[model samples]
Target chain A: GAMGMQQGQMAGGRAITVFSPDGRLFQVEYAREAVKKGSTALGMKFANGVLLISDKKVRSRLIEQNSIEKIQLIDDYVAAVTSGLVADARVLVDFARISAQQEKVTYGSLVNIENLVKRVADQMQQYTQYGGVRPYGVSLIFAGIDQIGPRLFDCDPAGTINEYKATAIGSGKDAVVSFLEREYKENLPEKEAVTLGIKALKSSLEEGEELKAPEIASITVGNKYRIYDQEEVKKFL
Target chain B: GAMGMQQGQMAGGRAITVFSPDGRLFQVEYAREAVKKGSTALGMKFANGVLLISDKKVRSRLIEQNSIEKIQLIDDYVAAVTSGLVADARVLVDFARISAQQEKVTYGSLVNIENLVKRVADQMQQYTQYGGVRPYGVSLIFAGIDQIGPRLFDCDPAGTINEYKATAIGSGKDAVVSFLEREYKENLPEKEAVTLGIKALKSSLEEGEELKAPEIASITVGNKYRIYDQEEVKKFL
Candidate 1:
């Protein structure tokens, strides 16, 4: 259906290979739709560290919960949660890990939070301009601890990245973002921040669905990085 | 020429589009040669800031001294001295400037020194792997001040970036590096750092050739970024 619309909008034989009459790249807009199909993910910065949480759906019991990883460790000091096509997210996550490791290997230091995310965004931006490539169908929340302390960034399919005290992406992002805006504070404790992220994800869930440990993944960054297991995540819930 | 060697190497059906029998890419190696043909550049970190210096040669009196810029300011906090093909350096510098500005616009802070250099190196690395593209024929010395203080990085055409207290690149790199190694010290004063950079450049020049103000440019990053004009550079010389 999206492809049909794309072809229909091709006035004067212009396709995604070229911009439309209004300078819009329809393929990129189509990629955004794919991102919207993903589950919700949120990130917040606390006094001591940052937290990234994502909500996942188990389509069937045949799929292993452990195999459905939405949060990825970029390095010892940086992690990211993706909200979009899992395959597409994997490509970007791999790029992020390479970027972090490349920095560490080259500079003998952890990559900075904003710079790492910007690099990912830059790569995504290229797909929009380069012929024979489609934009990535994923958005990411990057959280990391550096010399300057904890930082969080939200990046979109479009090459835009922005810092946030608290932010959300994917389905129901509007609801979760407004909830975060009302509840976030300057120096919330780490546990409280985790609770707030879980609460936001819960609020974004469908009417009758319930949130559970296996459907959630989280990463905390402070003195070090800790990826919470389902059991560990249950404690926060 | 380089093109002749490229075609000759293809006798065994090996080309840059495909790695050679020993798994080497000759085009990437050729790119390194282009870098060796460029002017000399040196960078050092001192007590309060970092210094980046470069040597320029004017072929004719009609060529304005200002027209030959080997060192460029990427941001208020980040600058780079390039050694290699000026055209290739321009492309990388433009990317670095955009990367810095994007980080500032997104995060409201200057990009970290190591991270910014890593981004440039990452781009250079890509050109080597992709088909129909040659690796960037340039090396760069990136100097900047961030939250952690002044930092300097040296990146080669191969995308290897290393943090340095003092380093040099280009035509007379060995001579300048040895000069820096013998004379550099921790907590060196700012004025003395400029003089030391000039001294290193002077030592790298050919016999009977003189180093002059117009042939030198420097960037000092501490409380602020200062680009030394010809008159000010003469004072340092």
Candidate 2:
């Protein structure tokens, strides 16, 4: 028997299962072609910066949607990841970028990860309620450094956010998360982070169980981020 | 009983009246303004021959009725006169101008007074039609002289036109006609013809009384014409 629970915790949707080197491979579903048609991502070196990617397709014809999502950051470092409807992901990313810029302008400094996440969460709650239905379908993975240390926060479809040392989303979630679980640790090496991110994506593709292709990967250096080209990734790997 | 058999014509509507001294001093009756809005005119002598004149006033909210209602001539030998709604007058003048130009262009000779008058009358009749309660009311007086001799043609509003030794139209017809009857003569010398024409006009202004001083009078000789201002008229009379 299927039982409906809370909105974000819906477990009935069909999804892609990914198996990577580690057993902690997380499973991300494609309610039909949600993940396949909706989102793309990239992971590069810790020193180089992580890249997140998505396009401009949206669910409704009546609304205009934003296009770009988050950039991953760590230490003076930055990194970010994204999933969900393109507009939602982009709105979250833009919110972050604007907040960071405003903080620099108004408060005389860049916004830290915690404050950035908090600002995003507050805005998502306020601005995202569409009429007659729960409005948002975007989740974000924000990684950057604050006064405390390097951190990662994953925001859910309903705007709730939590921290993760490493994370993944879309239908490739399991393979990515499992691989990252084994590779991620305190003071993780930048090269190892890149390799692990790539390996997680490759494992999902090789298994053919997760229907994702034309995979995109990016990484973050301490806090600065850079998206690596296919040739550059090949050379590094 | 007192009004029985009043040999006079009744005024039907608004009408404009004018008389030139060369040969005519008769008034014309009109049911409306002499010319509609948006009409124009141009006159010139033909190939160093007789003078020509055209009136092109297009009737509309933006145009003046009298701006182009006079004749232009080659020298004093030719002149064209028009009385109609401005638009009708302009179109007729344009047609005449084009026809004359076409005659010169194609035949390598200017259109003579007879041909020009016929062509304009034909063209006007072919184009205009009565609309609403108002009928199309455009007529022309092609008055000019060449080596062939001085000629006068009356073009009807229906486009039927005929040559005359003298003609009159509009509300001052009685005065102008009387003056012309008194002034016109066979084989009148060119200068005398012009002088008598002016005198008739001066008489018309006085409504049959002699003028102590002639008002403004325009004179055309062969293909050349000039406005005899009050000063110019005084010198002539």
Candidate 3:
């Protein structure tokens, strides 16, 4: 009984996370949920950009206009993965883009993620009051470049953010991230990273126990971030 | 001999036009060495709605992607406009839309002619300094309804925009507006308004003058502002 309790406690509290120098982080606590639900996301990095891919469907619900806030930038050097609240995430990306331009520097700057996430949280808090409820919630992954090197971070709804060398979000996030872990190396070639990312997402959507929307949205950011439209994604797949 | 002389004289100059609702006059001057090059635009007033149709193909140039700007909105309710830099008269219409939206108290009010033209000119002035040179040079015809009733306005590149009972702008602006002046009356029935507007546009386009772009863009704004696709336009004609 003591050993079983200890094992349960360890499992409940122990999870993988990472952080950037400027206080940005990625989380993977819900990995089991993703695995059980068979969620999927694609993550790819290049010298100039990074990309992420995921189906628009969440669980059994087919979201027509999803506002995903899945991808996060830990620093200018790294970005994160996300699989929910796509539109809201788009707004944050725009904010980050505008901020990057205004600061006259790259998004790799540590301030990019730290200040951006704070702003995002603030906006969400305000919306909850204005709308009488939170209309959209998001899970995020932060990817970007930093002084230390490129990094990824995952975040959850509890406002907890973590950094992970390899991580995922949504149902396929775990399976995909594990595949990424097996492939990613410190100086991995960009094309290989892109291939791995796409393959992971595709494998999840196609092979996972549960089948949902076949449509996928993917982006790559490193030296640059590239998003592929459905047609473009088809070509890669 | 007399007919030949008149024909020869009409083909020499560019058409210019202006109109005033308060003044109740429409003036047109045909271009020399040109066959009246008639153009038409009309706004039909329904019991609680208004519709506008225009046939203005000023100069021939293909519009590429990311090259359109301008929109036309209903009277007084709200402004909606396009934001491309390459489309000409389309930009004016977009500005008219914006003007209506910007000046309206509610989303239901359509912008009047006088208000529409002035707002477009104002925007033109603001955008002039952005690229060190102005890319906008077009005309606008504003249509909408308000507590005061339906209003129409015409605006030009030379910074002249004002309310008109019925007006047109472009190559045949003068001739078309003149025809409208003789036909338009306050609170005219919807069918009558449509017939007059379509006749004016057809006369302008098929008036023994060269019509550029086989297709014409026409719309009606009163009861329910609906755009007439090319096929529907044939039925209207």
lDDT of 1 by residue, A46-83 (tens): 76777787776667778876877777788777788888
lDDT of 2 by residue, B1-237 (tens): 111111122333221111111111122223234642212222222222222222121447677544433553322344566666646666667777777778778977664666776666554433221111333466666766644555566665544454454444443434554665665554455445546555555555455354454322233444345544446545656
Error of 2 at B166 (Å): 78
True contacts recovered per prediction: 0.00, 0.00, 0.00
Tens-digit lDDT string for candidate 3 (B2-121): 111111112222111111111110111111112122233444343444556655344545655122212354433322222222255565665555556666656554434444555566
- How good is model 3 by TM-score? 0.36
Off by over 4 Å in 1: A1-14, A214-222, B1-237
Position A152, candidate 2: lDDT: 63
The candidate with the higher lDDT, 2 or 3, is 2
How are the candidates ranked when ordered by lDDT, highest leading? 1, 2, 3
Query: Model 3 residue B2 lDDT?
Result: 14
Candidate 1 lDDT by residue in tens digits, B26-74: 5565566767777877888876777788876654221223645677888
- For candidate 3, give the lDDT of residue A216: 37
Report the C-alpha displacement of residue A51, candidate 3, in angstroms. Answer: 3.7
Supply the DockQ value of model 2.
0.01
Docking class of 2: incorrect
Question: Candidate 2 chain B: worst 10 consecutive residues by lDDT?
Answer: B16-25
Against the correct fold, how does model 1 do in TM-score? 0.51
Better of 1 and 3 by TM-score: 1
Candidates arranged by TM-score, highest first: 1, 3, 2
Tens-digit lDDT string for candidate 3 (A1-237)? 111122112211111132223332112222222223423555444454444556545421111123222334433354545544332344445455565555446543454445554554454344323322221234565555543445455555445555555556776565666777776654445556556666666665557444333333223342444445556555655
| Model 3 error, position B109 (Å) | 20
